[PDB]
Symmetry: C5
Amino acid sequence: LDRADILYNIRQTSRPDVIPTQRDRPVAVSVSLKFINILEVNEITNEVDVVFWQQTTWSDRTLAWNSSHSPDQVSVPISSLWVPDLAAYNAISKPEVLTPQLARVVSDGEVLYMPSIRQRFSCDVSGVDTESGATCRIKIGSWTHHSREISVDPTTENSDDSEYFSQYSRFEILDVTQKKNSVTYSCCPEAYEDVEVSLNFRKKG
Amino acid sequence: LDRADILYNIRQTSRPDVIPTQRDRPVAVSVSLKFINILEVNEITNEVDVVFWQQTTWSDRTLAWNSSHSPDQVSVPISSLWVPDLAAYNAISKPEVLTPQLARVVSDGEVLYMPSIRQRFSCDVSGVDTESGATCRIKIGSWTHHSREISVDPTDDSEYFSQYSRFEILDVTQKKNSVTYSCCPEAYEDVEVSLNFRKKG
Amino acid sequence: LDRADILYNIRQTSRPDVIPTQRDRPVAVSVSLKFINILEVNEITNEVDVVFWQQTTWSDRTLAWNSSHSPDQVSVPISSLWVPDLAAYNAISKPEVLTPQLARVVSDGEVLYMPSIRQRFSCDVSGVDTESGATCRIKIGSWTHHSREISVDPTDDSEYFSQYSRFEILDVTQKKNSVTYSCCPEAYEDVEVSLNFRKKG
Amino acid sequence: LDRADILYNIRQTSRPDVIPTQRDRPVAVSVSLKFINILEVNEITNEVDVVFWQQTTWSDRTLAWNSSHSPDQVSVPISSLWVPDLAAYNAISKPEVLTPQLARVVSDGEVLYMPSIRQRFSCDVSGVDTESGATCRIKIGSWTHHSREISVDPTDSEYFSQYSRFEILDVTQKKNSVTYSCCPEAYEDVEVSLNFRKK
Amino acid sequence: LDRADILYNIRQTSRPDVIPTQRDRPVAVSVSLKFINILEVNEITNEVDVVFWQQTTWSDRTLAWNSSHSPDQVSVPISSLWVPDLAAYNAISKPEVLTPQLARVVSDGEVLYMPSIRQRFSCDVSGVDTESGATCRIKIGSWTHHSREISVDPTDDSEYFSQYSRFEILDVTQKKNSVTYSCCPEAYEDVEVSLNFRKKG
Ligand SMILES: CO[C@H]1CC=C2CCN3CCC4=C(CC(=O)OC4)[C@]23C1
Ligand SMILES: CO[C@H]1CC=C2CCN3CCC4=C(CC(=O)OC4)[C@]23C1
Ligand SMILES: CO[C@H]1CC=C2CCN3CCC4=C(CC(=O)OC4)[C@]23C1
Ligand SMILES: CO[C@H]1CC=C2CCN3CCC4=C(CC(=O)OC4)[C@]23C1
Ligand SMILES: CO[C@H]1CC=C2CCN3CCC4=C(CC(=O)OC4)[C@]23C1
Ligand SMILES: [Mg+2]
Ligand SMILES: [Mg+2]
Ligand SMILES: [Mg+2]
């Protein structure tokens, strides 16, 4: 197989509308926000404007191919792939994607999609001008798929989600932590999972 | 049936431009606004900027399938479904959808669509800084389908309201109206949502 | 015929690129602006920001069907229909459509399309703070079709005007013009809508 | 032929990706800006916000039809036509098109396309508040086609809004040929000088 | 061959999703920024707003044709071509493309793509008001292709810079880097463009 064949095969047989589960085993999605720039902060309205790289990984075995004498990975337009329907629950603006909408697919079916996103959030900005800083929580999970269809999983301490933060920001990052949650909503009996990302930051000196 | 078959069947036989009226009864649509945030308020211009989850439900029996040895629900892109042509009659900005455009479909044909929407409204902001607060009315109904094609009915009032808003919700009431317009002999139904809110302490 | 058939037939045989001129008579288009809100006014720059419902009607006999054993009217996405290429000649922003892009089609081929539009205009704002008010003129006509292809005709001024606006409407008049442009020998029609309004208090 | 046949034929045989160079000759494009409004002006940043009608004409003989017992002209969505890849070289915002995207096509293959555009430009705003006024130059030409593929040629104050803060003193057009490092061939542009001032 | 044939052939056999690597050598991409304007600068937030022409060249031998009895070059919509997935790593707004999205393709398979882009960056603005000026670094490279798939290489600094800008360019230097990410073992290449500029007068 060459790249052209792999990409052709994926395009011709893609079901981007179909979550790649096998009932009742959920697709395990890992989500990790790499903060890049904090652009606007308003302590009066409790709103923040943020740029981050949304590292997103999951496995889709319908995409796998024999890697022998073939490339190990390809870049695929996300329009040809199923992609998890993640949403930021406390977002107050449309997510503005700043990067080419391509995912990286490995021959074993592992997918990495990492868009750079600019987006505005409603969160706690109180304390941003103090040395303790503000703690802004961003809640990300599947909009429509419950825990038996999509499970979302959180970084540990070992993930440094501030390692690409711009040195030229007015702001600086003190800490970034993730908390996994399961929530039940009135509409449905099943629980929905989310990752809660706590961004601890402050205005510099 | 597996998920892929259900979704394939729906996509291949979808008539998204066809209202699923059966027995000439109107399609019964339930609408309910869950307010999440109140972002900007202007008592001089009487304008408000709001984020809400628009809980929308109706039945489309053309989508039903067998719930034995099969999943009970699937997520479907709305581009493959008929969706009610609801509009907010006193909106002054385009509805900005903040969520993936997917609906949840149950095997009996019940559909739930619930986009998160940011939108600006012209409404009564007077009294926002008082104890009694302001009462802003939002009117939502079908743009083009009258009462014999679509009927609308309303379905913790701060259940999902952000604790970090400058504002707080005192009460939300959701009422049903029938209105006749000059163009048509028929009555058009809407839900009128009264949002009573005020600036925090 | 049922709804699904009518909509299928329209979609399958639609020529949205083709003006439905019958014989060599122009398509008669009626245009009428229902003002809903006046949101921003600037007397220094002579610009106004306005929300209106653009009531637009014309006949397309290629869409007609036998109304026996059939619905009387259907809602059709405008992408399946020819729609007149109307433009506001003194607009200074893109028209922002706030409503579902659907037209209402009667079995005799009558079409009604009525989007809610927010748009900014360059017009005379002088006198807005006086008792006489300002008179802002909005010029609407076909961008590319002359008077033998499209003719435009006008058809309570505050009927749907928001009671919460900073402004109020004194009068709305509509008159009809034919203009000849250097490019072409044929005349182009427009409707000129005069909005007489003033700041309250 | 009726209207529907002409439009069907055009749609079915349209090559909107293909410049209609006949006999190996450049397509002659005429460009003319009709200024309608001047909305914002900033003498500190040298930026101007402008609304204009971009009169654009050229010949595409692949579109011609026998006019006998047929309409002489039709309106065609530009998505069905080749259209010159004109750009404003000193623009600093995306062109915002305010009109239906239709061209007018005559039976001999002449095409007229005239969008109303609002766009922001970087140009010389100095002197806007004096009676000599400012002279803002707008440079428009093909982005990718050189002078043997597209040639541009010009062809006043007629539709300018009476309600603008500004007024037009004069509009002149010059025709330039420029060579760029990438290519040996010359690229043509029209330079439009807008002389205007505060009222 | 005529122009129409070349363009037809390219469109009919185009694989825009497929990087044109040959013999498992990376596609060599040349990137060069021609600065046209500096529109807004903020020394407090360290942000800059910039317009530049992104000169981008590479070879795609699948596009080559016999130039005998044929045009040497054509203009092709980029939607019909593979284009490198370059991104500005320190960009804080979406790239706003100001020019027709067309590339120039030579009969030997060389491609030149040069969009005019307006975009905002986070970079060092300190010293903009001094004689020494600020030095703003812009990092551009493939988003998803490593050094064995795409290699990037750089090619008057004020040549196309607008004479009417508040600012002036002192120097522009470009430098290739290889970076390894936690992501992946392979190294990713970028070009780092250093723009040394200052406030006029
Ligand atoms: C179809 O979209 C619905 C489908 C299922 C959901 C559970 C999680 N999700 C977001 C929050 C939310 C709901 C539904 C609800 O009742 O309230 C809030 C939904 C969106
Ligand atoms: C085609 O879209 C029209 C079709 C039918 C309607 C009934 C309610 N609806 C919104 C307001 C409104 C009208 C019709 C009208 O003339 O008055 C105002 C419409 C939209
Ligand atoms: C391409 O669409 C053209 C076709 C015919 C027109 C007459 C009315 N219309 C708007 C004003 C206007 C023109 C053309 C012209 O030369 O003057 C300005 C046009 C647009
Ligand atoms: C592919 O698009 C290129 C192809 C040919 C061009 C000459 C005119 N044009 C605009 C300015 C410009 C260039 C190319 C260049 O290197 O300098 C700047 C181009 C765009
Ligand atoms: C989906 O595209 C990913 C695939 C490979 C990459 C290396 C360069 N690139 C940008 C920054 C970046 C990553 C990957 C990563 O995990 O960290 C940061 C990527 C995007
Ligand atoms: Mg092969
Ligand atoms: Mg692995
Ligand atoms: Mg030939």
